Enzyme design. Structure first.
Site, PDB file in Angstrom:
ATOM      1  N   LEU A   1       0.812  -1.214   0.000  1.00 33.18           N
ATOM      2  CA  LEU A   1       0.000   0.000   0.000  1.00 33.18           C
ATOM      3  C   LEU A   1       0.848   1.268   0.000  1.00 33.18           C
ATOM      4  CD1 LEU A   1      -2.663  -1.184   2.586  1.00 33.18           C
ATOM      5  CD2 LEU A   1      -3.091  -0.733   0.162  1.00 33.18           C
TER       6      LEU A   1
ATOM      7  N   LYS B   1       1.885  -3.323   9.140  1.00 30.71           N
ATOM      8  CA  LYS B   1       3.019  -2.407   9.167  1.00 30.71           C
ATOM      9  C   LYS B   1       4.270  -3.164   9.585  1.00 30.71           C
ATOM     10  CE  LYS B   1       4.820   1.979  10.722  1.00 30.71           C
ATOM     11  NZ  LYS B   1       4.490   3.385  11.079  1.00 30.71           N
TER      12      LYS B   1
ATOM     13  N   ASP C   1       5.162  13.935  13.943  1.00 36.58           N
ATOM     14  CA  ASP C   1       5.480  13.768  12.527  1.00 36.58           C
ATOM     15  C   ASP C   1       4.262  14.047  11.643  1.00 36.58           C
ATOM     16  OD1 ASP C   1       7.129  13.221  10.352  1.00 36.58           O
ATOM     17  OD2 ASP C   1       6.712  11.067  10.397  1.00 36.58           O
TER      18      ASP C   1
ATOM     19  N   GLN D   1       7.205  -0.693   5.809  1.00 34.44           N
ATOM     20  CA  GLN D   1       6.356  -1.076   4.683  1.00 34.44           C
ATOM     21  C   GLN D   1       4.961  -1.426   5.193  1.00 34.44           C
ATOM     22  OE1 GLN D   1       9.611  -2.373   5.078  1.00 34.44           O
ATOM     23  NE2 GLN D   1      10.204  -0.685   3.720  1.00 34.44           N
TER      24      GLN D   1
ATOM     25  N   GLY E   1       7.062   4.306   3.992  1.00 33.45           N
ATOM     26  CA  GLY E   1       7.357   5.501   4.760  1.00 33.45           C
ATOM     27  C   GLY E   1       8.845   5.693   4.965  1.00 33.45           C
TER      28      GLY E   1
HETATM   29  N1  LIG Z   1      -3.869   2.430   7.646  1.00 31.28           N
HETATM   30  C1  LIG Z   1      -3.263   2.514   6.442  1.00 31.28           C
HETATM   31  N2  LIG Z   1      -3.904   2.167   5.305  1.00 31.28           N
HETATM   32  C2  LIG Z   1      -3.314   2.246   4.100  1.00 31.28           C
HETATM   33  N3  LIG Z   1      -2.052   2.673   3.931  1.00 31.28           N
HETATM   34  C3  LIG Z   1      -1.291   3.056   4.981  1.00 31.28           C
HETATM   35  C4  LIG Z   1      -1.869   2.993   6.328  1.00 31.28           C
HETATM   36  N4  LIG Z   1      -0.922   3.420   7.177  1.00 31.28           N
HETATM   37  C5  LIG Z   1       0.175   3.731   6.446  1.00 31.28           C
HETATM   38  N5  LIG Z   1      -0.047   3.508   5.134  1.00 31.28           N
HETATM   39  C6  LIG Z   1       0.935   3.740   4.048  1.00 31.28           C
HETATM   40  O1  LIG Z   1       2.221   3.255   4.454  1.00 31.28           O
HETATM   41  C7  LIG Z   1       3.177   4.319   4.417  1.00 31.28           C
HETATM   42  C8  LIG Z   1       4.172   4.216   5.563  1.00 31.28           C
HETATM   43  O2  LIG Z   1       3.491   3.986   6.793  1.00 31.28           O
HETATM   44  P1  LIG Z   1       3.831   4.890   8.078  1.00 31.28           P
HETATM   45  O3  LIG Z   1       2.896   4.482   9.191  1.00 31.28           O
HETATM   46  O4  LIG Z   1       3.916   6.332   7.633  1.00 31.28           O
HETATM   47  O5  LIG Z   1       5.318   4.380   8.450  1.00 31.28           O
HETATM   48  P2  LIG Z   1       6.599   5.362   8.518  1.00 31.28           P
HETATM   49  O6  LIG Z   1       6.801   5.579   9.999  1.00 31.28           O
HETATM   50  O7  LIG Z   1       7.702   4.575   7.858  1.00 31.28           O
HETATM   51  O8  LIG Z   1       6.181   6.605   7.773  1.00 31.28           O
HETATM   52  C9  LIG Z   1       2.368   5.606   4.475  1.00 31.28           C
HETATM   53  O9  LIG Z   1       3.046   6.693   3.838  1.00 31.28           O
HETATM   54  C10 LIG Z   1       1.066   5.231   3.798  1.00 31.28           C
HETATM   55  O10 LIG Z   1       1.115   5.471   2.387  1.00 31.28           O
HETATM   56 MG   LIG Z   2       4.958   8.115   7.738  1.00 34.06          MG
HETATM   57 MG   LIG Z   3       6.806   7.403  11.138  1.00 28.63          MG
END
Ligand SMILES: Nc1ncnc2c1ncn2[C@@H]1O[C@H](COP(=O)(O)OP(=O)(O)O)[C@@H](O)[C@H]1O
Ligand SMILES: [Mg+2]
Ligand SMILES: [Mg+2]
Length: 332
Positions: free
Chosen positions: A58, A77, A173, A65, A61
């Protein structure tokens, strides 16, 4: 009291190590004495007792992933090294929130900790990030998101961190790619704030604690950081401001100082409601100290008045326009 870096690794290890209810003790925590298994699109794998089918990736970050999955869809996650901290934060947030508020955030259903990484199982939001939505508008004639949606999203954000801060948590963040749009948007109601990996629980510190870390874990800085001043909750105020700036101009926010007055760069031509937005950015970017945080409620009312005065009728046409753009990207 003073604290250097609220994101320091040794600090988090000690904060977790001394919890009365450590993450390791949750009913929905699962520890494993082996390596993090391989996780890949359109593939099965064993996650504890259950077998889990992973669909497609999806998003990615700064650290992790996030995949779609089923055994009702949910997300995985995945992160190396392990991040029990994010699970701790998520748990505390849902405990402290009024149940009516929890829909604005992402629930973690369970956590699987391994020797070298972790899998956090959580709620799914199906229609991409706010950053992505901003990009979708770049590739249209209108180029930018309409004011009705921008003001609407802005108000929800102010409301969101108001709830988060009421739980004495700092997101830490807040930026476009940590906001997600879900199917609750099809039926700002569907906007959700995610990514709690860099979040701070102020309850784990003495009353009146402040921070002096001059930057975030990926280079970014808020107003107080740019002046080497102390900060706690202000970092979220900056994040919301930067996010709304990105919705308005499609680029990332940079700030300048003029006579002790902090303000964002750009000549602000082609910007409607110029008075509203200048008051918004003024209050959000010029916070005197940790004791005089501006009323998030008040900020939202000022946006509400303008919204009610121009966009009550039209929000239906605007969200439809966006949903069409969202579905096109999803099916792609
Ligand atoms: N609940 C969710 N549903 C769909 N996609 C998600 C969700 N949470 C995160 N993502 C996707 O995963 C990516 C990275 O997750 P994130 O929680 O931001 O981790 P990081 O701490 O690495 O940023 C996000 O930029 C988003 O596109
Ligand atoms: Mg993020
Ligand atoms: Mg983060």
């Amino acid at each position: 009291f003073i604290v250097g870096n609220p994101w320091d690794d040794k600090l988090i290890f000690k904060l977790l190590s001394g919890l009365s209810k450590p993450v390791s003790s949750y009913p929905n925590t699962f520890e494993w004495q082996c390596k993090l298994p391989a996780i890949k699109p359109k593939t099965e794998f064993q996650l504890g007792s259950k077998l889990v089918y992973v669909h497609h990736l999806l998003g990615e970050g700064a650290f992790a992933q996030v995949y779609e999955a089923t055994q009702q869809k949910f997300v995985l996650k995945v992160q190396k090294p392990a991040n029990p901290w994010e699970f701790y934060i998520g748990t505390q947030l849902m405990e402290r929130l009024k149940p009516s508020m929890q829909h604005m955030f992402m629930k973690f259903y369970s956590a699987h900790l391994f020797q070298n990484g972790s899998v956090l199982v959580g709620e799914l939001y199906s229609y991409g990030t706010l950053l992505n939505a901003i990009n979708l508008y770049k590739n249209t004639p209108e180029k930018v998101m309409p004011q009705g949606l921008v003001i609407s999203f802005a108000m929800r954000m102010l409301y969101m961190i108001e709830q988060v801060h009421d739980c004495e948590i700092i997101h830490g963040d807040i930026k476009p790619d940590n906001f997600i749009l879900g199917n609750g948007f099809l039926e700002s109601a569907g906007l959700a704030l995610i990514d709690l990996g860099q979040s701070i629980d102020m309850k784990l510190f003495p009353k009146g604690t402040i921070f002096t870390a001059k930057c975030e874990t990926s280079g970014f800085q808020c107003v107080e950081m740019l002046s080497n001043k102390p900060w706690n909750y202000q970092i979220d105020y900056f994040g919301v401001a930067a996010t709304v700036y990105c919705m308005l101009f499609g680029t990332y926010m940079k700030v300048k100082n003029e006579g002790g007055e902090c303000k964002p760069e750009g000549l602000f031509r082609r910007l409607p409601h110029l008075d509203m937005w200048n008051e918004f950015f003024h209050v959000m970017l010029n916070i005197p100290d940790c004791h005089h945080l501006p009323s998030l409620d008040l900020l939202r009312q000022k946006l509400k008045k303008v919204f009610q005065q121009h966009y009550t009728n039209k929000i239906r046409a605007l969200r439809n326009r966006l949903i069409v753009l969202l579905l096109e990207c999803k099916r792609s």
